[PDB]
Amino acid sequence: GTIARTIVLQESIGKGRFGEVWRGKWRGEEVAVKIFSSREERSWFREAEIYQTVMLRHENILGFIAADNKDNGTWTQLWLVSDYHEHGSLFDYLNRYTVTVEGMIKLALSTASGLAHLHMEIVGTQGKPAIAHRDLKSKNILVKKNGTCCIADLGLAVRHDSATDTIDIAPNHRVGTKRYMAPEVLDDSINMKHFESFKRADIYAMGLVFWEIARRCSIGGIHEDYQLPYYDLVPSDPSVEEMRKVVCEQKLRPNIPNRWQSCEALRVMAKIMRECWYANGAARLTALRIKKTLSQLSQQEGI
């Protein structure tokens, strides 16, 4: 179509489960293009559907431009065009850099603000359904030039119909990255007919991402090396069984260093992590509550 024909692909930057991500140029500006083959049409269409949800746009949600198709004369490519963020993922950012107390708060509050907007139902003519991500992780969050995050990779999301309390694609199987799966997803006790259960599982995963950020917070030159949550307990690419034995049976969570109590911002962060990590989803903080707590902290620090 009219958009893809005017885009020039400059570099393939990532090759994932579904689709390949490229850095392209559109009307002189850098954009990201996720490309799917003809046999991945269902995944492409579902991601285009989620990104076109009414009232989705938010500073902490990846900005979607358009779906399109491009025929090179041999095969058709299915495209999803979105804003480009040079820093890439929060995972890449945390591996490359340490952050200040200000930096940590900015990354955490922006993530929580984006998740609170996804989770929020807006009632009305141009209403927004509540959405649960189902695959929140540091590799699925991007960092903007201004040091704030935006949630990306929304292709596995589910949307709620509040009038009937039903889910648009009626999920009946576990999806997502195994390392970030909530205890109830790992042991399959989650009620997949209950939308609020998917919101609570996203909060558990957000708590894990907060732990990744807080390790990289450098105060008086003291910080931890970058690690994925559970690096000390499971192998790379862990199985559901490996994760379940640690999270559900032994009931372990990532370690919270006692020295995080020595700094007020790290103390607030550690308390949020614990209150995201409860085995009972109903006891977890909401994204809106976390946004409120971190907003109070950002105001105190003068960010």
Ligand X SMILES: Nc1ccc(Nc2ncnc3c2C(=O)CC=N3)cc1
Q: Tell me the window of 35-43, 82-90, 94-102, 243-251 that interacts with ligand X (CB under 6 A).
A: 82-90
Q: For residue 187, which amino acid is it?
A: D
Nearer to ligand X, 99 or 265 (CB): 99
Give the separation between CA 254 and CA 13, rounded to whole angstroms.
30
CA distances from 244 to 47, 247, 263, 291 (A): 29, 5, 33, 29
Minimum CB distance to ligand X, residue 108 (Å): 19
Minimum CB distance to ligand X, residue 16 (Å): 8
Nearer to ligand X, 84 or 204 (CB): 84
Which secondary-structure segment (H or E) carries 91? helix 90-96
Of the candidates 135, 153, 187, 225, the residue annotated as catalytic is 135
Respond yes or no: is residue 202 known to be catalytic: no
Residue 223, C-beta contacts closer than 8 angstroms, at least 6 positions apart: 98, 215, 216, 217
Q: Which of 99, 142, 247, 263 binds ligand X (CB under 6 A)?
A: 142
- Positions 149 through 188 that interact with ligand X (CB under 6 A): 152
Give the separation between CA 36 and CA 48, rounded to whole angstroms.
12
Minimum CB distance to ligand X, residue 34 (Å): 6
Nearer to ligand X, 176 or 183 (CB): 176
Look-up of token digits 């940590």: 104
- Positions 8 through 67 that interact with ligand X (CB under 6 A): 13-14, 21, 32, 62
Q: Tell me the window of 79-87, 160-168, 197-205, 257-265 that interacts with ligand X (CB under 6 A).
A: 79-87
Give the separation between CA 180 and CA 271, rounded to whole angstroms.
19
Annotated binding site: 13-21, 34
Per rule CB under 6 A, is residue 92 in the interface with ligand X?
yes
The maximal CA–CA distance of the chain, rounded, in angstroms, is: 62
List the end-to-end C-alpha distance of the chain, in Å, as a whole number. Answer: 43
Give the interface size with ligand X as a residue count (CB under 6 A). Answer: 14
Give the separation between CA 96 and CA 88, rounded to whole angstroms.
11
Nearer to ligand X, 87 or 292 (CB): 87
